[PDB]
Swiss-Prot record, chain A:
The chain holds residues 718 to 782 of 938 of the full protein. Detected throughout the brain, in brain cortex, cerebellum, thalamus and olfactory bulb. The lineage of its organism: Eukaryota, Metazoa, Chordata, Craniata, Vertebrata. Component of N-methyl-D-aspartate (NMDA) receptors (NMDARs) that function as heterotetrameric, ligand-gated cation channels with high calcium permeability and voltage-dependent block by Mg(2+). NMDARs participate in synaptic plasticity for learning and memory formation by contributing to the long-term potentiation (LTP). Channel activation requires binding of the neurotransmitter L-glutamate to the GluN2 subunit, glycine or D-serine binding to the GluN1 subunit, plus membrane depolarization to eliminate channel inhibition by Mg(2+). NMDA is probably regulated by C-terminal phosphorylation of an isoform of NR1 by PKC. Its phosphorylated state is influenced by the formation of the NMDAR-PPP2CB complex and the NMDAR channel activity. Heterotetramer; the NMDAR subunits are modular and harbor tiered domains that function in concert to regulate opening and closing of the cation-selective ion channel pore. Forms heterotetrameric channels composed of two GluN1/zeta subunits (GRIN1), and two identical GluN2/epsilon subunits (GRIN2A, GRIN2B, GRIN2C or GRIN2D) or GluN3 subunits (GRIN3A or GRIN3B) (in vitro). Can also form heterotetrameric channels that contain at least two GluN1 subunits and at least two different GluN2 subunits (or a combination of one GluN2 and one GluN3 subunits) (in vitro). Glycans are attached at Q54. It comes from the Eukaryota. Coiled coil: none annotated. Glycine binds at D15. A hydrophobic region that gives rise to the prediction of a transmembrane span does not cross the membrane, but is part of a discontinuously helical region that dips into the membrane and is probably part of the pore and of the selectivity filter. The extracellular N-terminal domain (ATD) is a site of allosteric regulation to modulate overall receptor function. It comes from Rattus norvegicus (Rat). It is found in: Cell membrane; Postsynaptic cell membrane; Synaptic cell membrane; Postsynaptic density membrane. This is Glutamate receptor ionotropic, NMDA 1.
Curated annotation (Swiss-Prot), chain B:
Glycans are attached at N40, N120. Component of N-methyl-D-aspartate (NMDA) receptors (NMDARs) that function as heterotetrameric, ligand-gated cation channels with high calcium permeability and voltage-dependent block by Mg(2+). Participates in synaptic plasticity for learning and memory formation by contributing to the long-term depression (LTD) of hippocampus membrane currents. Channel activation requires binding of the neurotransmitter L-glutamate to the GluN2 subunit, glycine or D-serine binding to the GluN1 subunit, plus membrane depolarization to eliminate channel inhibition by Mg(2+). The extracellular N-terminal domain (ATD/NTD) endows NMDARs with a unique capacity for allosteric modulation, harboring several binding sites for small molecule ligands that act as subunit-specific allosteric modulators of ion channel activity. A hydrophobic region that gives rise to the prediction of a transmembrane span does not cross the membrane, but is part of a discontinuously helical region that dips into the membrane and is probably part of the pore and of the selectivity filter. It comes from Rattus norvegicus. The gene is Grin2b. This is Glutamate receptor ionotropic, NMDA 2B. The chain holds residues 452 to 715 of 1482 of the full protein.
Length: 65, 147
């Protein structure tokens, strides 16, 4: 982000989502319009956890609510 | 009990899918409903089928709702899905928002906004889940058929 706003280089590869977040706060950078590797956020999940179904359907409500 | 050929994006995803996966594909077609929705005691559709294990491997892609989530073991998203509505032809009209009264009570509003889904509309059930005001406006807005 530093050298980006500094424009010491052509463009900056980053999370295009997070790019939209940064372009939101500061528009001094023009992000591309391309589409690649679009997934989403995450949380720590290791093997068996009540967060398996709890977090799964929990997300189902998250978008659902 | 008659064979009829198939195609489509998700179908191809199955082609390469089972291909690398190495799982011999038996492709059938469905009769009742679209995907499925709890009818009275169970899903009204292929959700019930694979749920009844009428399909050990479920086919098709429709984003699983929380109901469809808790239904049974579900696949991962193949692509991002979502709700929407067609807009004829700037623009900037809409109504107000998804569950907003301009959509939810559009007949109550001066200009009517009538848009909806077909019988047991999946996105409509989501609305039926989300907000029933438009589900009443669906009385004015009830869709039938796709094209």
């Amino acid at each position: 982000i530093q050298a980006v706003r500094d424009n010491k280089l052509h463009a900056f590869i980053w999370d295009s989502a997070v790019l939209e977040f940064e372009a939101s706060q500061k528009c001094d950078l023009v992000t591309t319009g391309e589409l690649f590797f679009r997934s989403g956020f995450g949380i720590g999940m290791r093997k068996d956890s009540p967060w398996k179904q709890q977090v799964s359907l929990s997300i189902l409500k998250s978008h659902e609510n | 009990y008659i064979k009829k050929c198939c195609k489509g994006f998700c179908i191809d995803i199955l082609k390469k899918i089972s291909k690398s996966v190495k799982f011999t594909y038996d492709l059938y077609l469905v009769t009742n409903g679209k995907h499925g929705k709890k009818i009275n005691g169970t899903w009204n559709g292929m959700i019930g089928e694979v749920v009844m294990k009428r399909a050990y491997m479920a086919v098709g892609s429709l984003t699983i709702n929380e109901e469809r989530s808790e239904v049974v073991d579900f696949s991962v998203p193949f692509i991002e899905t979502g709700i929407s509505v067609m807009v004829s032809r700037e623009y900037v009209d809409q109504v107000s928002g998804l569950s907003d009264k301009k959509f939810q009570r559009p007949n109550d509003f001066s200009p009517p906004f009538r848009f909806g889904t077909v019988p047991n509309g999946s996105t409509e059930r989501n609305i039926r889940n989300n907000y029933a005001e438009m589900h009443a406006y669906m009385g004015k807005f009830n869709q039938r058929g796709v094209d």
